[PDB]
């Protein structure tokens, strides 16, 4: 029972590695894409001005 309990624990832990790494990569990419989109918006606004 103890072995299977902390086996479920380590399985959840491995899922946690995968989820945390994916979330970190996704947020970094989202920040970079937001910076690029803001750059495009600002240079278009500058051209309009």
């Amino acid at each position: 029972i103890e072995i299977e309990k902390m086996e479920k624990k380590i399985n959840d832990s491995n899922l946690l590695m995968k989820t945390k790494i994916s979330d970190a990569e996704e947020l970094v990419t989202s920040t970079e894409l937001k910076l690029e989109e803001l750059k495009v918006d600002l240079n278009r606004k500058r051209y309009k001005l």
Partner: protein, 53 residues
């Protein structure tokens, strides 16, 4: 009185011996019970975990 003597020296020892044997058997089957419950927990956790991943 002969029937009474059977009850208290033939039926009575038989029923006391049956009582100890049946109490030992009751102990036997509650140990069967908690061991079957422990296997129950084993299969329940195995099923829930394996379905989970």
């Amino acid at each position: 009185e002969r029937s009474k003597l059977d009850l208290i020296e033939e039926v009575e020892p038989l029923v006391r011996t049956l009582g100890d044997k049946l109490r030992k058997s009751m102990g036997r089957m509650q140990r069967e019970l908690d061991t079957l419950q422990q296997t129950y927990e084993l299969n329940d956790l195995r099923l829930k975990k394996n379905i989970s991943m």
